[PDB]
Symmetry: C3
Subunit: 335 residues, 3 copies
């Protein structure tokens, strides 16, 4: 029984940050209470001013990451302001039953509902808006994020030994299908429903116009780059609700990677590139051993550097000449 466990409330933070949380916890099963508000909005998605008629949780792509522990219960209040055009609902991949919650959360504009489900399974899980068997749209327009259900005992390697991250980051990869006019420039829509027919048509082509990390081309670069330092251990949570992707850290690795994102299975080690299946979320742990500016990307490099699926990590610390050294700098070829 669940109506009698201690109810707690979590303040959510917008990506790429994850709300503060305990890994291995002394604590016992709780009900964790969260609130998310759907926000439909036109967002600028690239540097030449192209816009998406987007649909977000809490006004960001991805929605924020929800952290709990195995055996906890998740209790969500989903809010659909009257200023929105469309109905919404939520399918938690971590939940069990009634289409992951979607049947119990159909909120029209100006409505709200509260769902609870047991987080009986550990790993990173996608949550995303739902279609009644209908051409996605809501999903690809931005309605997804991650639920992370940590093992009560912390993260464990294949031999059972414990693993701890100093900090977790969350990346949502969105394949966008922005329509083009006869002039060959991208279309700009006044309202959401205006964008529908043209978008559906682009979707059939299975060819994203852009693929972005966290809402925008270059969203995780420059002033907004991720940060860590040598010796630090990061957990990179990668969600892709609709399409396969292949994450990679440049001059880095995946020390321990759950590419299927299910913590009960033994992680894999030493990975150069791993694979997030469309409609799943995986996680990777890396301990930085060198300073400098790393890139973190989808290693279809067209998708990365031509379509937008890439970001940076700025790393403080001491250069290690053992791991890598420049024996001879670029110089003219011997006469």
């Amino acid at each position: 029984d669940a109506d009698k466990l201690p109810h707690t409330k979590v303040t959510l933070v917008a990506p790429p940050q994850v709300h503060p949380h305990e890994q291995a916890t002394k604590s016992g099963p709780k009900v964790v209470e969260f609130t998310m508000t759907i926000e439909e909005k036109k967002m600028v998605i690239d540097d030449k001013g192209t816009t998406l008629q987007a649909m977000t949780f809490n006004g960001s792509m991805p929605g924020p990451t929800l952290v709990v522990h195995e055996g906890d219960y998740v209790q969500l209040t989903l809010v659909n302001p009257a200023t929105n055009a469309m109905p919404h609902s939520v399918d938690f991949h971590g939940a069990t039953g009634a289409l992951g919650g979607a049947k119990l959360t159909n909120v029209n504009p100006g409505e709200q509902a509260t769902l609870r489900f047991k987080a009986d399974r550990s790993g990173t899980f996608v949550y995303h808006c739902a279609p009644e068997g209908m051409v996605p749209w809501h999903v690809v327009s931005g309605m997804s994020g991650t639920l992370m259900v940590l093992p009560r005992d912390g993260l464990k390697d294949p031999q059972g030994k414990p693993l701890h991250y100093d900090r977790a980051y969350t990346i949502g990869e969105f394949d966008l299908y922005i329509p083009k006019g006869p002039d060959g420039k991208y279309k700009d829509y006044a309202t959401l429903a205006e964008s529908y027919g043209d978008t559906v048509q682009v979707m059939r082509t299975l060819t994203p116009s852009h693929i972005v990390f966290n809402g925008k081309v270059g969203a995780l670069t420059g002033a907004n780059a991720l940060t860590a330092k040598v010796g630090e251990t990061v957990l990179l949570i990668h969600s892709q609700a609709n399409r396969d992707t292949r994450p990679h850290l440049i001059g880095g690795h995946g020390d321990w990677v759950w590419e299927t994102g299910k913590f009960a299975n033994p992680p894999q080690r030493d990975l150069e590139t791993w694979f997030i299946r469309g409609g799943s979320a995986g996680a990777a742990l890396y301990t930085f051993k060198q300073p400098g500016v790393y890139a973190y990307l989808n290693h279809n490099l067209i998708e990365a550097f031509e379509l937008g699926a890439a970001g940076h990590i700025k790393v403080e610390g001491k250069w290690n000449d053992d791991l890598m050294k420049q024996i001879k700098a670029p110089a003219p070829i011997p006469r």
Copy 2:
């Protein structure tokens, strides 16, 4: 030595059912005998009447699923009626040598042949047509299915614990490449050969016009939906001979999943979505805990809901409030 062993005869059932079989067995190596007849035919593949000049094993997509046990010998008589136009053959991914049988099963129309092979490795394996010259086409037009080679002792988890399913279902997902007219509507061909040139042209674009489970859009929906009940454990065999896919069960999971579909390896638990590599078949077990109508799909949702890679499972039983509760129904937002 092979001829010595008992020769038994299986009569196959059409998908989505799997022919009655024993999981864990006390029997010893038998030579299991099957017959499949190649049916060339035009089939209606969607709700708006679009046709496919199809090629099939036993007049269905996929072919029926052949079940044996590790160490059994598979003996297939392959019939190519005089009424067909094209030659055929078969490649079992489960067999060893001569292109998986293909070089020894080259039947012209009005010919038949009999191939035996040792089923020495266990798992779900794709079988597909594989002539000289024109392999993809025969394959994409519908000529694949699954051979399930069960390990002699039944299915085992990573610890060695025994695993048992109550009913098994076979889903073959087919990426279809139907040509279009200059007026934008799908072409309708009088004969199979007339479809060739136009189809190949669509094929080079690597973009399916449709992607269907078992021969058509909504083949596993409504009256034809898969059926189960709370406490039942199902094996969902998923084959895709030509193209990657990523199966998911909405508000379900894979309790145990061999995504590469080879049973000697340890399965994975708690998967939200798994990945069937093009030209492979995989398997997942799930034990239902909630009633209702589940959706089984390719979790590229464009491919699912727009191109047709989706089906339903209708689940009988009693709602478990512990797993999920609608705390508060969709009401107006408080002031």
Copy 3:
């Protein structure tokens, strides 16, 4: 300390061969010294005379495979001759730091540089010309290969049992984006620079015009086929620097398969089809049990048989009827 270790020189060999090397070794850590010279050249990539303005390490696609042992140091001198027209660098997926060595190997035509890194992790790793955050033109144009870091002890099955191969072969799968004219025929470019704008544009569509193994359609067939014999065990190293592939050996398997290509991880057995992620290199082991002609291919059959992703292995030895026998040859259907 590295400078005080023995320095050895390796002569590199052209694919599909891998330079002579020891699997399990009693030798201590060494600094293994390599030289690669970048060559930009126009190449014929299909049977119908289509050309690619290519870029290569050592005048081949892929670049030669570099073999070392866990604990060794790789020391590459990258030579960019004054005969080339573009700058180049190198990113080793098996290196830690500075975009995998890219930031310290930027050589303008007529320059060269020398890089050292510690091969601290075991597996097959891609190396490729680094695109410092730009459209991956050099990559898709041919600039990648594998670095194999063998564990010092040899390869190990999931139980710790030792595995050994008689020969290793390296296949680099390249997805090409050759432009077309208004007339519908593939373009031919006078210089490499002239090919840029048009190519980038094809790339944006994510649809390769061709997908070739080792630098052209049928490059590993006929006189150039891979060769083995019954009882021989081969390592098949498959790299794809930019796009997903799914290798399969026809009427063959992957006895042990590191599809993520990292040897410190348990391999999987009995695979019909494996999955190399774009931006990674995987390895498979197979012991031939039947003679004849085999096809090694991408099991997206459109990509294999129409776009060019397939090769052949010729296998010597004696047919084994227990594994597979032709019971009745193709002959008229009886009454």
